């Protein structure tokens, strides 16, 4: 489900998912960019079982994630067989600043 | 349990043993006094053979003649991993050498521990009067006040299987029973020490205790 | 021998737990010598004919460079570990005069079963002497290790500082933690002195409060 | 309808049986003692426990 | 305190450090609107 | 342990030792009285108890009108007929093994199979 790999072929993305699908086998600073993602998803996962040792995978979160995904499906009707206008750099830089916006608490010190 | 040792369902029984308290009174049909006027043969005939061993294997010129016997009860030694050495080296280390203190077998048919206090050289004029007084008192705190095996404050353990979920190694959860040990009565300061149980994991239902024993947080 | 065994199980747990809170204090303890198996436990602090002696059990430990960084106020520790159970008030005068002869501003006292108040009421000593009595039979098991205790870390001054002037905080406002706590007692905590505590959290992943010994 | 009730009425005939099995075995005192319970209070969870699922 | 004391000027804190959110909450909004509906009924 | 009274003053005997014999005899605390001993039991205390369970247990236990009625055999007489009761001590961990009177013959069985 989430491993992506541009050099070998168990993991490897299918050309048709996007627009700059072809000559994005054997790159090598986009596979750095899917490798720190996929790091930070291993990383992830270990917290969560630290943080739930039953493995509960339902919580109580804010942001129905799901939800935007559909209206985001149904709004702009995605065929599910074009492929995608978006590139992975984007896609990876896109999600870090939307973790960088999420702002609870606006103070300019170390400790907040 | 100890996570090495979680399914092993003797391994829990021996935990089981070892935190639940247990004394005299829970294992002990009856307690009689008889009047034996020497500690050589007795006068009662079920348990001749029992002393011919024990005295043969031996003091006996300064015992009262006043003999405690308990008969004890055969299921409580099986529903309690209890023999009858382990009772009488406690009832023999509790009153040191001032009871002397022979048992019956385990094979036996009839569960009889036999007990005679010590007299000293001094002479007595009084204190015969009251022995008999002075028995049933040590009789009384010989019964509750006798720890044979568990710690305090224990009233019973009872023994579940429940349902954790363990990460397997393919990566999935799945769902490994384990053996649990509920108990009755909190002495949470020192189940926790005994070996063979996992000290990281124990929950007590008294969060009093939880902030007396591990923490405010 | 069956109890006997079973008082050396206690005391290697005791000395396991005692080396966990002294790394866990900031001094320099190795990881080896942490988990010392019962084996070479007994090979070294337990005699020919088998009983474990305390006097060459007790030992001495120093602060780490980062612990240094972070609080250049504290030096050596000795911990020492008894063989009586009831300590006389001689006993612990000499363990007293010993720390203040070899300059140790830190003694943790592992005695056996009790402490006479005739010597209870000398263990606060010459400032900045601290003596921390703890009993054996409260360190067999390692409080810390527990899944409901969380990470608590002490905080120095200057984090202490930075913590009440970024709040805004008075030091009444803090959460407190009592100066007998069992964790509080395992850090070692003077009054004054906060830990920042980091839990898990249900809502937000890891959650990092404070509290303030009083 | 008849045929369910029929079915209902052996359904309770049936929990009263074995009812009356659990009590005539705990009368000739050959019931075991759950742990941590006496006799009596296993014999009362048992016909409570069949005359629960009869009713379910 | 530490940062203030008693009722100086440094009580109101300058507009280039405030760390407050930049949302009108629901209690600001409430009490806004009533405040300038209560003058707006006024003339 | 058949508690024994003094036959002069009807009060209670109590063992003594004797140094002249080395016997177990019963002195009466108040008249002086000695007798001596036919048992040398003096003091018996049961945790668990089998007696109380048949109590109230009368000539005409049969006359109750609340007491159930069973068809067993009596293994005296060869009786159909008989009353019942369970074990009339109150201790909670009791057992609930019925006791049978034959109204024949007034003879106490029991259904216990664990005894037989
Ligand atoms: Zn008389
Ligand atoms: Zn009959």
Redesign the pocket.
């Given at each position: 489900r989430y491993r992506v790999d541009l050099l070998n072929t168990d993991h490897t993305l299918d050309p048709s998912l996007l627009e700059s699908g072809s000559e994005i086998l054997g790159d090598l600073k986009l596979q750095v960019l899917l490798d720190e993602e996929y790091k930070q998803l291993v990383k992830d996962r270990k917290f969560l079982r630290e943080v739930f040792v039953d493995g509960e995978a339902n919580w109580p979160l804010p942001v129905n994630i799901r939800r935007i995904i559909q209206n985001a499906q149904q709004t702009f009707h995605i065929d599910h067989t074009k492929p995608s206008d978006l590139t992975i750099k984007d896609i990876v830089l896109g999600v870090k600043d939307l973790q960088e916006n999420l702002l609870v608490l606006r103070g300019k010190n170390e400790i907040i | 349990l100890e996570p090495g040792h979680a399914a092993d369902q003797e391994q829990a029984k021996l935990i089981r043993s070892a935190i639940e308290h247990t004394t005299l009174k829970s294992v002990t049909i009856a307690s009689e006094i008889y009047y034996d006027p020497d500690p050589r043969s007795t006068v009662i005939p079920e348990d001749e053979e029992i002393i011919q061993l024990h005295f043969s294997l031996l003091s006996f010129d300064q015992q009262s003649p006043w003999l405690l016997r308990l008969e004890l009860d055969r299921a409580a030694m099986n529903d309690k991993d209890l023999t009858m050495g382990q009772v009488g080296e406690r009832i023999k280390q509790t009153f040191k050498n001032d009871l002397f203190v022979i048992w019956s077998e385990d094979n036996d048919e009839k569960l009889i521990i036999r007990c005679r206090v010590v007299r000293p050289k001094s002479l007595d004029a009084e204190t015969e009067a009251e022995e008999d007084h002075m028995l049933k008192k040590i009789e009384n705190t010989m019964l509750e006040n006798i720890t044979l095996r568990g710690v305090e404050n224990i009233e019973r353990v009872v023994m579940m299987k429940y349902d954790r979920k363990v990460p397997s190694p393919t990566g999935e959860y799945v769902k490994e029973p384990e053996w649990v040990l509920e108990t009755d009565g909190v002495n949470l300061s020192e189940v926790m020490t005994v070996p063979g149980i996992d000290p990281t994991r124990i929950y007590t239902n008294s969060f009093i205790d939880i902030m007396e024993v591990l923490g405010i947080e | 021998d069956q109890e006997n065994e079973r008082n050396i199980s206690r005391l290697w747990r005791a000395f396991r737990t005692v080396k966990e809170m002294v790394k866990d204090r900031g001094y320099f303890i190795t990881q080896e010598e942490v988990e010392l198996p019962l084996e070479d436990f007994k090979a070294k602090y337990c005699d020919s004919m088998g009983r474990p002696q305390r006097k060459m059990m007790s030992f001495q430990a120093n602060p780490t460079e980062e612990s240094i960084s972070k609080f250049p106020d504290m030096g050596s520790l000795w911990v020492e570990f008894c063989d009586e159970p009831s300590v006389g008030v001689k006993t612990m005068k000499t363990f007293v005069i010993h720390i203040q002869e070899k300059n140790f501003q830190t003694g943790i006292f592992v005695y056996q079963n009790n402490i006479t108040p005739s010597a209870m009421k000398l263990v606060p000593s010459i400032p900045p002497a601290t003596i921390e009595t703890f009993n054996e039979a409260a360190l067999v098991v390692n409080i810390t290790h527990h899944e409901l205790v969380p990470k608590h870390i002490r905080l120095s001054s200057d984090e202490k500082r930075e913590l009440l002037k970024r709040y805004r905080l008075k030091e009444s406002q803090l959460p407190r933690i009592q100066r007998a706590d069992p964790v509080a007692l395992y850090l070692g905590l003077k009054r004054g002195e906060v830990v920042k505590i980091i839990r898990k959290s249900e809502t937000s992943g890891r959650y990092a409060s404070y509290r303030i010994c009083m | 309808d008849g045929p369910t009730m029929r079915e209902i009425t052996e359904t309770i005939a049936e929990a009263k049986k074995k009812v009356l099995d659990v009590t005539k075995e705990a009368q000739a005192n050959l019931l075991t003692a759950k742990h941590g319970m006496t006799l009596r209070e296993s014999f009362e969870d048992n016909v409570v426990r069949f005359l629960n699922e009869a009713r379910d | 305190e530490q940062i203030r004391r008693k009722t100086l000027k440094e009580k109101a804190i300058p507009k280039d450090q405030r760390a407050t959110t930049p949302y009108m909450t629901k209690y600001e909004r409430a009490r806004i609107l009533g405040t300038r509906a209560l003058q707006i009924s006024m003339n | 342990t058949t508690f024994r009274?003094?036959?002069?003053?009807?009060?209670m005997?109590y063992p003594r030792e004797d140094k002249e014999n080395n016997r177990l005899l019963f002195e009466?605390?108040?008249?002086?009285?000695v007798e001596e001993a036919g048992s040398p039991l003096v003091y018996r205390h049961e945790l668990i108890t089998n007696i109380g369970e048949t109590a109230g247990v009368v000539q005409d236990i049969g006359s109750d009108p609340t007491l159930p009625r069973s068809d067993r055999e009596c293994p005296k007489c060869h009786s159909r007929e008989n009353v019942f009761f369970q074990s009339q001590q109150r201790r909670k961990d009791t057992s609930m093994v019925l006791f049978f009177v034959c109204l024949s013959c007034s003879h106490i069985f029991t259904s216990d199979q664990k005894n037989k």
């Open positions: - | - | - | - | - | 009274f003094c036959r002069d003053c009807n009060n005997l009466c605390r108040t008249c002086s009285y």
